[PDB]
């Protein structure tokens, strides 16, 4: 047999093939805009698979919180507010009910914090834990990742690389972790969607999305969709103290974690610096110019990222 | 230490409802108020080795993915509008499989009149298809409003999907014309979007028969607080089923009451409200308080349980 597999096709070839097979024009952003009653509902889905996004050994509460968060992150990144959610679960017959009870308590906590509601879902048995959450968002103004203008400044929220450091910390399987380390582990396990940026993005963002697979990588989605070149400056990337602590203590380059670190779930949006709002952890990292691709310090850059295939 | 298999499917739903302190959870769709009318939210999953096999024709699976979920929307008087697809795919799955799957999905959407606007992807060891569907209705019809004196109706025929399944599991060299018909009804269910209007106007309670009549009748019985009386001799049996039952020495009634995945509707309303143009069949009547009985006796459900 010589017929092509997904491994050979790659995630981006897969995505393009589905879009083309569906002949859909509404698709390529973090959510799917859909007009309704003059307003625009934002639809999005996300999965967390055991062994792929988390391990059964993790604290279920954190996974339930995260299952909602990463999804709220997509709704927020396009300028919308989370409303209703559905959860589709693949659970092994031998799973502890306490794991599921606790998981949902994490779900409840997140929804109460993001102010959305889990109105239903689905159950099915399976070999391993599968968590698929669907989210419905409401928004006055949709903000894709294609409207970036030239000259615009490139801003990110929070700090980067923390999550990748937290994941490596989790893999060490230590019995005890130092306070700064738990902070990082914290960011990987219970990420928090920047739902506090809705107002801002929805009003002053020309283009926006959330960093989920790594800055450099997702930056390419932005550049491509909009049709510009992304000029990023490493020594302007918001780094974390605990991240620097982890890097000092373990011998790694912080920059390396901020450019190619995943699951940070911060935002990536562009707009005129004249629209900057100092009352938010906003951090300009680069500029939108003519050309194509993403340049870190005026250079190539692989890039590296997550990619399932 | 307590596992999911010991809790049971109803127990797991119960626990989730209580833990989420939810009011909406309870029937086929999730009724949501949004600008005059209500939106209907629902999701269904197809897992490899659980709902289908990798050998099955991929376009049929794509179709079923959409149908099974439309079935829940229709079942509550709504119409399909937007769908999202979350896929778990093994790195070795052939590209043609995903392409053919999306063809069956493409045309399922053209048939039901809904568009797929996005979804998700992830590496995985087994194919997993989680569909999210958003539909809309002018009048939500759940499964708690059955009135005493209402007549109990189902659409099409029952027990076909289970037989089609069994035929597939036999892995015969080749099948008879009728065995292909049954295998088809199992591989390619067809949501009853042609009943939307009848449910929306005249049904008091409604739902689709995904796990089996007797088992799903309970949800309705329990949800409406009534007692559902069913008569086996009134259950609609297709000709292909009778032919299959005859040939393998099986009782058609057993397949009608416990056969799953037929995706027909089960709804109640005054007998007079009966619409002869659609293929509905009265099978029982709504009596007073608790239970689901068949020919007098209170048969114990044998529907498909996940736990
Ligand atoms: N993991 C989950 N999280 C939240 N709600 C869930 C859920 N799994 C199931 N539910 C909800 O519980 C209710 C019903 O389960 P029930 O088994 O009677 O039917 P169903 O509507 O799920 C169709 P089917 O059973 O054929 O897949 C639904 O209203 C659904 O939204
Ligand atoms: N199986 C599938 N079917 C249909 N659309 C899909 C899909 N998998 C992904 N998509 C769609 O393709 C587009 C984007 O993929 P992209 O990888 O850039 O981001 P994402 O929105 O999926 C968020 P993240 O990667 O952080 O989960 C989206 O508009 C999404 O709806
Ligand atoms: C067990 C385990 N191994 C590795 C990682 C790293 N990781 C996995 S998926 C992902 C991006 C997810 O988003 P999406 O699903 O949208 O691709 C990242 C950074 C992890 N979290 N857990
Ligand atoms: C390999 C294999 N073994 C058995 C069956 C039968 N079956 C599985 S799930 C189900 C109900 C599904 O709806 P839900 O997922 O809502 O429970 C039925 C009738 C099958 N299709 N494939
Ligand atoms: Mg994203
Ligand atoms: Mg995802
Ligand atoms: Mg996402
Ligand atoms: Mg990704
Ligand atoms: Mg990406
Ligand atoms: Mg149902
Ligand atoms: Mg289901
Ligand atoms: Mg269903
Ligand atoms: Mg079921
Ligand atoms: Mg059921």
PDB file of N, CA and C in Angstrom, chain A residues 4-7 11 15 18 21 23-26 32 34 36-37 44-47 49 84 86 88 90-91 93-97 108 117-119 121-125 127-128 132 134 138 306 308-309, chain B residues 2-5 12 16 19-21 23-24 30 32 34-35 37 42-43 45 47 50 82 84 86 88-89 91-95 102 106 115 117 119-123 125-126 130 132 136 304 306-307:
ATOM      1  N   UNK A   4      -1.386   7.763   0.584  1.00  0.00           N
ATOM      2  CA  UNK A   4      -1.040   8.725   1.634  1.00  0.00           C
ATOM      3  C   UNK A   4      -1.864   8.716   2.929  1.00  0.00           C
ATOM      4  N   UNK A   5      -1.150   8.837   4.050  1.00  0.00           N
ATOM      5  CA  UNK A   5      -1.730   8.854   5.396  1.00  0.00           C
ATOM      6  C   UNK A   5      -1.715  10.266   5.984  1.00  0.00           C
ATOM      7  N   UNK A   6      -2.362  10.435   7.134  1.00  0.00           N
ATOM      8  CA  UNK A   6      -2.428  11.737   7.788  1.00  0.00           C
ATOM      9  C   UNK A   6      -1.061  12.188   8.269  1.00  0.00           C
ATOM     10  N   UNK A   7      -0.255  11.229   8.718  1.00  0.00           N
ATOM     11  CA  UNK A   7       1.101  11.505   9.186  1.00  0.00           C
ATOM     12  C   UNK A   7       1.891  12.229   8.112  1.00  0.00           C
ATOM     13  N   UNK A  11      -1.087  18.439   9.672  1.00  0.00           N
ATOM     14  CA  UNK A  11      -2.285  19.108  10.172  1.00  0.00           C
ATOM     15  C   UNK A  11      -2.836  20.191   9.242  1.00  0.00           C
ATOM     16  N   UNK A  15      -6.402  20.283   7.389  1.00  0.00           N
ATOM     17  CA  UNK A  15      -7.318  21.409   7.505  1.00  0.00           C
ATOM     18  C   UNK A  15      -7.733  21.949   6.144  1.00  0.00           C
ATOM     19  N   UNK A  18     -10.190  19.600   4.312  1.00  0.00           N
ATOM     20  CA  UNK A  18     -11.550  19.589   4.843  1.00  0.00           C
ATOM     21  C   UNK A  18     -12.278  20.840   4.381  1.00  0.00           C
ATOM     22  N   UNK A  21     -12.948  20.353   0.804  1.00  0.00           N
ATOM     23  CA  UNK A  21     -13.960  19.327   0.575  1.00  0.00           C
ATOM     24  C   UNK A  21     -15.331  19.865   0.948  1.00  0.00           C
ATOM     25  N   UNK A  23     -15.989  23.058   0.931  1.00  0.00           N
ATOM     26  CA  UNK A  23     -16.210  24.254   0.125  1.00  0.00           C
ATOM     27  C   UNK A  23     -16.816  25.320   1.047  1.00  0.00           C
ATOM     28  N   UNK A  24     -16.206  25.469   2.221  1.00  0.00           N
ATOM     29  CA  UNK A  24     -16.658  26.426   3.220  1.00  0.00           C
ATOM     30  C   UNK A  24     -15.762  27.659   3.177  1.00  0.00           C
ATOM     31  N   UNK A  25     -16.372  28.833   3.296  1.00  0.00           N
ATOM     32  CA  UNK A  25     -15.619  30.075   3.298  1.00  0.00           C
ATOM     33  C   UNK A  25     -15.577  30.625   4.726  1.00  0.00           C
ATOM     34  N   UNK A  26     -16.486  30.134   5.567  1.00  0.00           N
ATOM     35  CA  UNK A  26     -16.578  30.534   6.977  1.00  0.00           C
ATOM     36  C   UNK A  26     -15.737  29.547   7.774  1.00  0.00           C
ATOM     37  N   UNK A  32     -16.264  30.163  14.555  1.00  0.00           N
ATOM     38  CA  UNK A  32     -17.008  30.242  13.310  1.00  0.00           C
ATOM     39  C   UNK A  32     -18.109  31.281  13.517  1.00  0.00           C
ATOM     40  N   UNK A  34     -21.422  33.322  12.896  1.00  0.00           N
ATOM     41  CA  UNK A  34     -22.713  32.951  12.348  1.00  0.00           C
ATOM     42  C   UNK A  34     -23.680  34.051  12.739  1.00  0.00           C
ATOM     43  N   UNK A  36     -26.990  36.039  13.629  1.00  0.00           N
ATOM     44  CA  UNK A  36     -28.262  35.705  14.250  1.00  0.00           C
ATOM     45  C   UNK A  36     -28.810  36.909  15.021  1.00  0.00           C
ATOM     46  N   UNK A  37     -30.034  37.310  14.679  1.00  0.00           N
ATOM     47  CA  UNK A  37     -30.677  38.457  15.307  1.00  0.00           C
ATOM     48  C   UNK A  37     -29.747  39.661  15.348  1.00  0.00           C
ATOM     49  N   UNK A  44     -17.360  27.280  18.538  1.00  0.00           N
ATOM     50  CA  UNK A  44     -16.041  26.675  18.574  1.00  0.00           C
ATOM     51  C   UNK A  44     -16.037  25.403  19.399  1.00  0.00           C
ATOM     52  N   UNK A  45     -15.102  24.517  19.087  1.00  0.00           N
ATOM     53  CA  UNK A  45     -14.982  23.266  19.808  1.00  0.00           C
ATOM     54  C   UNK A  45     -13.519  22.985  20.120  1.00  0.00           C
ATOM     55  N   UNK A  46     -13.288  22.138  21.120  1.00  0.00           N
ATOM     56  CA  UNK A  46     -11.936  21.784  21.524  1.00  0.00           C
ATOM     57  C   UNK A  46     -11.913  20.440  22.225  1.00  0.00           C
ATOM     58  N   UNK A  47     -10.790  19.740  22.101  1.00  0.00           N
ATOM     59  CA  UNK A  47     -10.671  18.451  22.748  1.00  0.00           C
ATOM     60  C   UNK A  47      -9.441  18.360  23.622  1.00  0.00           C
ATOM     61  N   UNK A  49      -7.482  15.030  25.085  1.00  0.00           N
ATOM     62  CA  UNK A  49      -7.402  13.568  25.076  1.00  0.00           C
ATOM     63  C   UNK A  49      -6.368  13.037  26.060  1.00  0.00           C
ATOM     64  N   UNK A  84     -23.167  29.278  26.144  1.00  0.00           N
ATOM     65  CA  UNK A  84     -23.566  27.911  26.430  1.00  0.00           C
ATOM     66  C   UNK A  84     -22.533  26.904  26.000  1.00  0.00           C
ATOM     67  N   UNK A  86     -21.565  22.478  25.742  1.00  0.00           N
ATOM     68  CA  UNK A  86     -21.982  21.093  25.711  1.00  0.00           C
ATOM     69  C   UNK A  86     -20.679  20.337  25.882  1.00  0.00           C
ATOM     70  N   UNK A  88     -18.885  16.544  25.454  1.00  0.00           N
ATOM     71  CA  UNK A  88     -18.983  15.184  24.938  1.00  0.00           C
ATOM     72  C   UNK A  88     -17.830  14.425  25.600  1.00  0.00           C
ATOM     73  N   UNK A  90     -15.759  10.682  26.482  1.00  0.00           N
ATOM     74  CA  UNK A  90     -15.437   9.282  26.232  1.00  0.00           C
ATOM     75  C   UNK A  90     -14.817   8.827  27.545  1.00  0.00           C
ATOM     76  N   UNK A  91     -15.504   7.937  28.252  1.00  0.00           N
ATOM     77  CA  UNK A  91     -15.021   7.458  29.535  1.00  0.00           C
ATOM     78  C   UNK A  91     -14.882   5.940  29.576  1.00  0.00           C
ATOM     79  N   UNK A  93     -15.045   2.284  31.166  1.00  0.00           N
ATOM     80  CA  UNK A  93     -15.938   1.660  32.141  1.00  0.00           C
ATOM     81  C   UNK A  93     -15.336   1.518  33.556  1.00  0.00           C
ATOM     82  N   UNK A  94     -14.012   1.490  33.633  1.00  0.00           N
ATOM     83  CA  UNK A  94     -13.289   1.328  34.886  1.00  0.00           C
ATOM     84  C   UNK A  94     -12.845   2.646  35.506  1.00  0.00           C
ATOM     85  N   UNK A  95     -13.340   3.762  34.984  1.00  0.00           N
ATOM     86  CA  UNK A  95     -12.972   5.067  35.524  1.00  0.00           C
ATOM     87  C   UNK A  95     -13.693   5.287  36.849  1.00  0.00           C
ATOM     88  N   UNK A  96     -12.997   5.862  37.824  1.00  0.00           N
ATOM     89  CA  UNK A  96     -13.566   6.148  39.145  1.00  0.00           C
ATOM     90  C   UNK A  96     -14.628   7.246  39.029  1.00  0.00           C
ATOM     91  N   UNK A  97     -15.813   7.042  39.611  1.00  0.00           N
ATOM     92  CA  UNK A  97     -16.853   8.066  39.500  1.00  0.00           C
ATOM     93  C   UNK A  97     -16.373   9.359  40.136  1.00  0.00           C
ATOM     94  N   UNK A 108     -17.920  23.307  36.702  1.00  0.00           N
ATOM     95  CA  UNK A 108     -18.811  24.267  37.355  1.00  0.00           C
ATOM     96  C   UNK A 108     -18.087  25.553  37.770  1.00  0.00           C
ATOM     97  N   UNK A 117     -22.727  28.634  30.744  1.00  0.00           N
ATOM     98  CA  UNK A 117     -23.398  27.497  31.356  1.00  0.00           C
ATOM     99  C   UNK A 117     -23.251  26.220  30.536  1.00  0.00           C
ATOM    100  N   UNK A 118     -23.092  25.093  31.220  1.00  0.00           N
ATOM    101  CA  UNK A 118     -22.997  23.800  30.549  1.00  0.00           C
ATOM    102  C   UNK A 118     -24.419  23.240  30.532  1.00  0.00           C
ATOM    103  N   UNK A 119     -25.107  23.382  29.401  1.00  0.00           N
ATOM    104  CA  UNK A 119     -26.496  22.938  29.281  1.00  0.00           C
ATOM    105  C   UNK A 119     -26.750  21.521  28.789  1.00  0.00           C
ATOM    106  N   UNK A 121     -24.742  17.628  26.867  1.00  0.00           N
ATOM    107  CA  UNK A 121     -23.591  16.958  26.315  1.00  0.00           C
ATOM    108  C   UNK A 121     -23.873  15.518  25.957  1.00  0.00           C
ATOM    109  N   UNK A 122     -22.826  14.698  25.945  1.00  0.00           N
ATOM    110  CA  UNK A 122     -22.974  13.299  25.580  1.00  0.00           C
ATOM    111  C   UNK A 122     -22.041  12.351  26.339  1.00  0.00           C
ATOM    112  N   UNK A 123     -22.489  11.106  26.502  1.00  0.00           N
ATOM    113  CA  UNK A 123     -21.709  10.067  27.177  1.00  0.00           C
ATOM    114  C   UNK A 123     -21.454   8.875  26.242  1.00  0.00           C
ATOM    115  N   UNK A 124     -20.287   8.267  26.385  1.00  0.00           N
ATOM    116  CA  UNK A 124     -19.943   7.105  25.590  1.00  0.00           C
ATOM    117  C   UNK A 124     -18.792   6.384  26.250  1.00  0.00           C
ATOM    118  N   UNK A 125     -18.763   5.060  26.147  1.00  0.00           N
ATOM    119  CA  UNK A 125     -17.653   4.340  26.743  1.00  0.00           C
ATOM    120  C   UNK A 125     -16.518   4.349  25.720  1.00  0.00           C
ATOM    121  N   UNK A 127     -11.841   3.368  25.359  1.00  0.00           N
ATOM    122  CA  UNK A 127     -10.609   2.884  25.963  1.00  0.00           C
ATOM    123  C   UNK A 127     -10.024   3.939  26.890  1.00  0.00           C
ATOM    124  N   UNK A 128      -9.881   5.162  26.404  1.00  0.00           N
ATOM    125  CA  UNK A 128      -9.336   6.207  27.252  1.00  0.00           C
ATOM    126  C   UNK A 128     -10.234   7.435  27.352  1.00  0.00           C
ATOM    127  N   UNK A 132     -14.453  16.431  24.797  1.00  0.00           N
ATOM    128  CA  UNK A 132     -14.790  17.355  23.722  1.00  0.00           C
ATOM    129  C   UNK A 132     -15.853  18.329  24.210  1.00  0.00           C
ATOM    130  N   UNK A 134     -18.011  21.908  23.352  1.00  0.00           N
ATOM    131  CA  UNK A 134     -18.498  22.792  22.308  1.00  0.00           C
ATOM    132  C   UNK A 134     -18.966  24.062  23.004  1.00  0.00           C
ATOM    133  N   UNK A 138     -21.455  34.844  22.070  1.00  0.00           N
ATOM    134  CA  UNK A 138     -22.272  35.943  21.589  1.00  0.00           C
ATOM    135  C   UNK A 138     -21.336  37.122  21.383  1.00  0.00           C
ATOM    136  N   UNK A 306       2.991  22.807  17.939  1.00  0.00           N
ATOM    137  CA  UNK A 306       2.407  21.544  18.351  1.00  0.00           C
ATOM    138  C   UNK A 306       2.134  20.620  17.168  1.00  0.00           C
ATOM    139  N   UNK A 308      -0.653  18.041  15.330  1.00  0.00           N
ATOM    140  CA  UNK A 308      -0.976  16.672  15.680  1.00  0.00           C
ATOM    141  C   UNK A 308      -0.443  15.708  14.621  1.00  0.00           C
ATOM    142  N   UNK A 309      -0.188  16.231  13.426  1.00  0.00           N
ATOM    143  CA  UNK A 309       0.320  15.406  12.333  1.00  0.00           C
ATOM    144  C   UNK A 309       1.474  16.084  11.579  1.00  0.00           C
TER     145      UNK A 309
ATOM    146  N   UNK B   2     -15.485   2.576  43.757  1.00  0.00           N
ATOM    147  CA  UNK B   2     -16.515   2.674  42.714  1.00  0.00           C
ATOM    148  C   UNK B   2     -16.128   3.144  41.308  1.00  0.00           C
ATOM    149  N   UNK B   3     -16.431   2.311  40.318  1.00  0.00           N
ATOM    150  CA  UNK B   3     -16.140   2.612  38.921  1.00  0.00           C
ATOM    151  C   UNK B   3     -17.402   3.002  38.146  1.00  0.00           C
ATOM    152  N   UNK B   4     -17.210   3.528  36.939  1.00  0.00           N
ATOM    153  CA  UNK B   4     -18.316   3.953  36.086  1.00  0.00           C
ATOM    154  C   UNK B   4     -19.254   2.813  35.731  1.00  0.00           C
ATOM    155  N   UNK B   5     -18.698   1.627  35.509  1.00  0.00           N
ATOM    156  CA  UNK B   5     -19.514   0.467  35.160  1.00  0.00           C
ATOM    157  C   UNK B   5     -20.493   0.080  36.265  1.00  0.00           C
ATOM    158  N   UNK B  12     -24.699   8.041  36.045  1.00  0.00           N
ATOM    159  CA  UNK B  12     -23.711   9.013  35.609  1.00  0.00           C
ATOM    160  C   UNK B  12     -24.375  10.320  35.173  1.00  0.00           C
ATOM    161  N   UNK B  16     -24.006  13.968  37.080  1.00  0.00           N
ATOM    162  CA  UNK B  16     -23.579  15.152  36.335  1.00  0.00           C
ATOM    163  C   UNK B  16     -24.607  16.268  36.458  1.00  0.00           C
ATOM    164  N   UNK B  19     -24.294  17.573  40.102  1.00  0.00           N
ATOM    165  CA  UNK B  19     -23.046  18.295  40.285  1.00  0.00           C
ATOM    166  C   UNK B  19     -23.044  19.629  39.567  1.00  0.00           C
ATOM    167  N   UNK B  20     -23.773  19.703  38.469  1.00  0.00           N
ATOM    168  CA  UNK B  20     -23.835  20.924  37.687  1.00  0.00           C
ATOM    169  C   UNK B  20     -25.066  21.726  38.121  1.00  0.00           C
ATOM    170  N   UNK B  21     -25.851  21.150  39.033  1.00  0.00           N
ATOM    171  CA  UNK B  21     -27.076  21.786  39.533  1.00  0.00           C
ATOM    172  C   UNK B  21     -27.839  22.360  38.337  1.00  0.00           C
ATOM    173  N   UNK B  23     -30.844  22.533  35.269  1.00  0.00           N
ATOM    174  CA  UNK B  23     -32.279  22.439  35.094  1.00  0.00           C
ATOM    175  C   UNK B  23     -32.583  22.010  33.661  1.00  0.00           C
ATOM    176  N   UNK B  24     -31.763  22.472  32.722  1.00  0.00           N
ATOM    177  CA  UNK B  24     -31.951  22.139  31.315  1.00  0.00           C
ATOM    178  C   UNK B  24     -31.728  20.664  30.994  1.00  0.00           C
ATOM    179  N   UNK B  30     -30.943  20.714  24.095  1.00  0.00           N
ATOM    180  CA  UNK B  30     -30.801  21.687  25.161  1.00  0.00           C
ATOM    181  C   UNK B  30     -31.473  22.960  24.692  1.00  0.00           C
ATOM    182  N   UNK B  32     -32.477  26.589  24.535  1.00  0.00           N
ATOM    183  CA  UNK B  32     -31.871  27.836  24.959  1.00  0.00           C
ATOM    184  C   UNK B  32     -32.634  29.035  24.398  1.00  0.00           C
ATOM    185  N   UNK B  34     -33.074  32.549  22.985  1.00  0.00           N
ATOM    186  CA  UNK B  34     -32.249  33.556  22.348  1.00  0.00           C
ATOM    187  C   UNK B  34     -32.969  34.374  21.297  1.00  0.00           C
ATOM    188  N   UNK B  35     -33.421  35.556  21.704  1.00  0.00           N
ATOM    189  CA  UNK B  35     -34.102  36.469  20.799  1.00  0.00           C
ATOM    190  C   UNK B  35     -35.406  35.893  20.225  1.00  0.00           C
ATOM    191  N   UNK B  37     -37.235  33.313  19.643  1.00  0.00           N
ATOM    192  CA  UNK B  37     -37.223  31.860  19.484  1.00  0.00           C
ATOM    193  C   UNK B  37     -36.161  31.156  20.329  1.00  0.00           C
ATOM    194  N   UNK B  42     -27.217  20.244  20.895  1.00  0.00           N
ATOM    195  CA  UNK B  42     -27.061  18.813  21.112  1.00  0.00           C
ATOM    196  C   UNK B  42     -25.769  18.292  20.503  1.00  0.00           C
ATOM    197  N   UNK B  43     -25.298  17.173  21.030  1.00  0.00           N
ATOM    198  CA  UNK B  43     -24.075  16.564  20.542  1.00  0.00           C
ATOM    199  C   UNK B  43     -24.206  15.041  20.620  1.00  0.00           C
ATOM    200  N   UNK B  45     -21.721  11.280  19.644  1.00  0.00           N
ATOM    201  CA  UNK B  45     -20.407  10.789  19.234  1.00  0.00           C
ATOM    202  C   UNK B  45     -20.423   9.401  18.615  1.00  0.00           C
ATOM    203  N   UNK B  47     -17.720   6.365  17.970  1.00  0.00           N
ATOM    204  CA  UNK B  47     -16.373   5.890  18.289  1.00  0.00           C
ATOM    205  C   UNK B  47     -16.040   4.586  17.592  1.00  0.00           C
ATOM    206  N   UNK B  50     -17.083   1.038  18.668  1.00  0.00           N
ATOM    207  CA  UNK B  50     -18.246   1.225  19.523  1.00  0.00           C
ATOM    208  C   UNK B  50     -19.501   1.575  18.721  1.00  0.00           C
ATOM    209  N   UNK B  82     -26.394  24.835  12.286  1.00  0.00           N
ATOM    210  CA  UNK B  82     -24.937  24.832  12.236  1.00  0.00           C
ATOM    211  C   UNK B  82     -24.353  23.659  12.993  1.00  0.00           C
ATOM    212  N   UNK B  84     -20.550  21.561  14.130  1.00  0.00           N
ATOM    213  CA  UNK B  84     -19.104  21.596  14.290  1.00  0.00           C
ATOM    214  C   UNK B  84     -18.708  20.143  14.476  1.00  0.00           C
ATOM    215  N   UNK B  86     -15.674  17.530  15.804  1.00  0.00           N
ATOM    216  CA  UNK B  86     -14.455  17.304  16.555  1.00  0.00           C
ATOM    217  C   UNK B  86     -14.045  15.891  16.178  1.00  0.00           C
ATOM    218  N   UNK B  88     -11.013  12.756  16.225  1.00  0.00           N
ATOM    219  CA  UNK B  88      -9.824  12.166  16.827  1.00  0.00           C
ATOM    220  C   UNK B  88      -9.359  11.206  15.721  1.00  0.00           C
ATOM    221  N   UNK B  89      -8.157  11.426  15.198  1.00  0.00           N
ATOM    222  CA  UNK B  89      -7.657  10.601  14.102  1.00  0.00           C
ATOM    223  C   UNK B  89      -6.268  10.003  14.320  1.00  0.00           C
ATOM    224  N   UNK B  91      -2.621   8.750  13.273  1.00  0.00           N
ATOM    225  CA  UNK B  91      -1.731   9.269  12.233  1.00  0.00           C
ATOM    226  C   UNK B  91      -1.657   8.395  10.966  1.00  0.00           C
ATOM    227  N   UNK B  92      -2.004   7.117  11.091  1.00  0.00           N
ATOM    228  CA  UNK B  92      -1.952   6.213   9.956  1.00  0.00           C
ATOM    229  C   UNK B  92      -3.232   6.154   9.139  1.00  0.00           C
ATOM    230  N   UNK B  93      -4.289   6.821   9.593  1.00  0.00           N
ATOM    231  CA  UNK B  93      -5.539   6.806   8.837  1.00  0.00           C
ATOM    232  C   UNK B  93      -5.257   7.392   7.449  1.00  0.00           C
ATOM    233  N   UNK B  94      -5.758   6.742   6.404  1.00  0.00           N
ATOM    234  CA  UNK B  94      -5.525   7.253   5.064  1.00  0.00           C
ATOM    235  C   UNK B  94      -6.344   8.507   4.741  1.00  0.00           C
ATOM    236  N   UNK B  95      -5.688   9.443   4.063  1.00  0.00           N
ATOM    237  CA  UNK B  95      -6.276  10.709   3.661  1.00  0.00           C
ATOM    238  C   UNK B  95      -7.594  10.531   2.930  1.00  0.00           C
ATOM    239  N   UNK B 102     -15.869  13.292   4.742  1.00  0.00           N
ATOM    240  CA  UNK B 102     -16.397  14.644   4.571  1.00  0.00           C
ATOM    241  C   UNK B 102     -17.301  14.818   3.365  1.00  0.00           C
ATOM    242  N   UNK B 106     -20.811  16.256   3.785  1.00  0.00           N
ATOM    243  CA  UNK B 106     -21.200  17.347   2.906  1.00  0.00           C
ATOM    244  C   UNK B 106     -22.623  17.175   2.392  1.00  0.00           C
ATOM    245  N   UNK B 115     -25.184  23.757   7.678  1.00  0.00           N
ATOM    246  CA  UNK B 115     -23.810  23.910   7.237  1.00  0.00           C
ATOM    247  C   UNK B 115     -22.821  23.572   8.354  1.00  0.00           C
ATOM    248  N   UNK B 117     -19.599  24.634   9.991  1.00  0.00           N
ATOM    249  CA  UNK B 117     -18.801  25.856  10.025  1.00  0.00           C
ATOM    250  C   UNK B 117     -17.429  25.746  10.677  1.00  0.00           C
ATOM    251  N   UNK B 119     -14.655  23.012  13.460  1.00  0.00           N
ATOM    252  CA  UNK B 119     -14.503  21.840  14.286  1.00  0.00           C
ATOM    253  C   UNK B 119     -13.138  21.773  14.928  1.00  0.00           C
ATOM    254  N   UNK B 120     -12.673  20.554  15.151  1.00  0.00           N
ATOM    255  CA  UNK B 120     -11.379  20.346  15.767  1.00  0.00           C
ATOM    256  C   UNK B 120     -10.709  19.065  15.237  1.00  0.00           C
ATOM    257  N   UNK B 121      -9.432  18.898  15.564  1.00  0.00           N
ATOM    258  CA  UNK B 121      -8.698  17.702  15.177  1.00  0.00           C
ATOM    259  C   UNK B 121      -7.682  17.355  16.257  1.00  0.00           C
ATOM    260  N   UNK B 122      -7.307  16.085  16.309  1.00  0.00           N
ATOM    261  CA  UNK B 122      -6.344  15.614  17.290  1.00  0.00           C
ATOM    262  C   UNK B 122      -5.820  14.224  16.944  1.00  0.00           C
ATOM    263  N   UNK B 123      -4.553  13.975  17.244  1.00  0.00           N
ATOM    264  CA  UNK B 123      -4.014  12.652  16.979  1.00  0.00           C
ATOM    265  C   UNK B 123      -4.767  11.794  17.994  1.00  0.00           C
ATOM    266  N   UNK B 125      -5.589   7.166  18.984  1.00  0.00           N
ATOM    267  CA  UNK B 125      -5.359   5.783  18.595  1.00  0.00           C
ATOM    268  C   UNK B 125      -6.534   5.168  17.830  1.00  0.00           C
ATOM    269  N   UNK B 126      -7.728   5.696  18.077  1.00  0.00           N
ATOM    270  CA  UNK B 126      -8.937   5.225  17.415  1.00  0.00           C
ATOM    271  C   UNK B 126      -9.709   6.411  16.849  1.00  0.00           C
ATOM    272  N   UNK B 130     -17.044  13.403  17.149  1.00  0.00           N
ATOM    273  CA  UNK B 130     -17.939  14.100  18.039  1.00  0.00           C
ATOM    274  C   UNK B 130     -18.556  15.255  17.253  1.00  0.00           C
ATOM    275  N   UNK B 132     -21.355  18.455  16.990  1.00  0.00           N
ATOM    276  CA  UNK B 132     -22.075  19.468  17.748  1.00  0.00           C
ATOM    277  C   UNK B 132     -23.008  20.134  16.760  1.00  0.00           C
ATOM    278  N   UNK B 136     -32.754  25.381  15.369  1.00  0.00           N
ATOM    279  CA  UNK B 136     -33.703  26.361  15.890  1.00  0.00           C
ATOM    280  C   UNK B 136     -35.153  25.948  15.703  1.00  0.00           C
ATOM    281  N   UNK B 304     -29.408  -0.320  24.743  1.00  0.00           N
ATOM    282  CA  UNK B 304     -27.959  -0.237  24.791  1.00  0.00           C
ATOM    283  C   UNK B 304     -27.547   0.683  25.927  1.00  0.00           C
ATOM    284  N   UNK B 306     -24.245   2.236  28.168  1.00  0.00           N
ATOM    285  CA  UNK B 306     -22.816   2.469  27.979  1.00  0.00           C
ATOM    286  C   UNK B 306     -22.079   1.942  29.216  1.00  0.00           C
ATOM    287  N   UNK B 307     -22.760   1.978  30.356  1.00  0.00           N
ATOM    288  CA  UNK B 307     -22.192   1.490  31.603  1.00  0.00           C
ATOM    289  C   UNK B 307     -23.273   0.719  32.354  1.00  0.00           C
TER     290      UNK B 307
END
